[PDB]
Amino acid sequence: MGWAAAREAAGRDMLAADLRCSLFASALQSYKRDSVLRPFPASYARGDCKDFEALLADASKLPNLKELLQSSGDNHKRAWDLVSWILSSKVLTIHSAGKAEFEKIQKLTGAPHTPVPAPDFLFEIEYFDPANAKFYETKGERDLIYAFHGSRLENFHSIIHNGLHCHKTSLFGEGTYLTSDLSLALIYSPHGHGWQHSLLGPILSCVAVCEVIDHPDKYFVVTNNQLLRVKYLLVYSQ
Ligand SMILES: NC(=O)c1cccc(N)c1
């Protein structure tokens, strides 16, 4: 939450820090920013009134993270307040994974079935307690299944903080679409605009790898949000 703690977080894992900045930039740029940029930095809201022009303005003046970490403020207070906000969570963290990691995800999802591309970047999501212990409690003796969910890039800031995919709900039969076949997930992950100063590249596509408690529920739909969580992000840079 502080400048000193963000500097440390960004330092450990640049790519994870950059992914968060990129997903923020994607949600903020979107014409759907009001709906997709949730959570929204409180410092840019009077009441329920979101200062999007002030936000777009400060986000566009952000240097890349190597440049930010070489500055240490103090005239760059706005940049650090925003980046420190982007990098904050008491619920979870994002970590960089290798590419021998894709082999692990392909093992958990089985034989690729359809030929598909390897992600350019891989990220693992760590959940904190109570939620992480609660998840395994709900799991019990049941085994964990791994399936994919693709989405437009402007939706992953929200997916990573609120999960898939929240329930005003209003309609019946609502739930998350999953598939063991990444090729099917990928057609729902088109390239979207990221961040111009990203180490990942400015145009990205992102697929979620979901950890599902095996319960009675080619693709399938999970109606109970308590029995799944996002565990990995597969990032492709155009
Ligand atoms: N959004 C998705 O990644 C997905 C996966 C399986 C089936 C469908 N309709 C969608």
Swiss-Prot record:
EC number: 2.4.2.-
Record remark on domains: The PARP alpha-helical domain (also named HD region) is regulatory, it packs against the catalytic domain.
Location of ADP-ribosyl aspartic acid modifications: 34
Residues with PTM N6-(ADP-ribosyl)lysine: 107, 134
Binding site for NAD(+): 149, 177, 219
Cytoplasmic side: 2-238
Modification sites for ADP-ribosyl glutamic acid: 67
Post-translational modification: Auto-mono-ADP-ribosylated.
Protein name in the entry: Protein mono-ADP-ribosyltransferase PARP16
Gene: PARP16
Free-text function comment from the UniProt entry: Intracellular mono-ADP-ribosyltransferase that plays a role in different processes, such as protein translation and unfolded protein response (UPR), through the mono-ADP-ribosylation of proteins involved in those processes. Acts as an inhibitor of protein translation by catalyzing mono-ADP-ribosylation of ribosomal subunits, such as RPL14 and RPS6, thereby inhibiting polysome assembly and mRNA loading. Mono-ADP-ribosylation of ribosomal subunits is promoted by NMNAT2.
